[PDB]
Amino acid sequence: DCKRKVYPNGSISDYCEY
- Give the residue among 5, 6, 7 at the shortest CA–CA distance from 15: 5
Contact (CB, 8 A) for 1 and 16:
no
Distance CA 18, CA 11 (A): 22
Sequence-ordered list of residues with C-beta below 8 angstroms from that of 1, at least 6 positions apart, any chain: none
User: What's the distance, Cα to Cα, between the start and end of the chain in Å?
Assistant: 9
Distance CA 13, CA 11 (A): 7
Upper half-sphere CA count for residue 2 (Cβ side, 13 Å): 9
Handedness of CA 8, 9, 11, 15 (dihedral sign): negative
Distance CA 18, CA 3 (A): 11
- Mapped onto helix, strand or coil, the DSSP state of residue 16 is coil
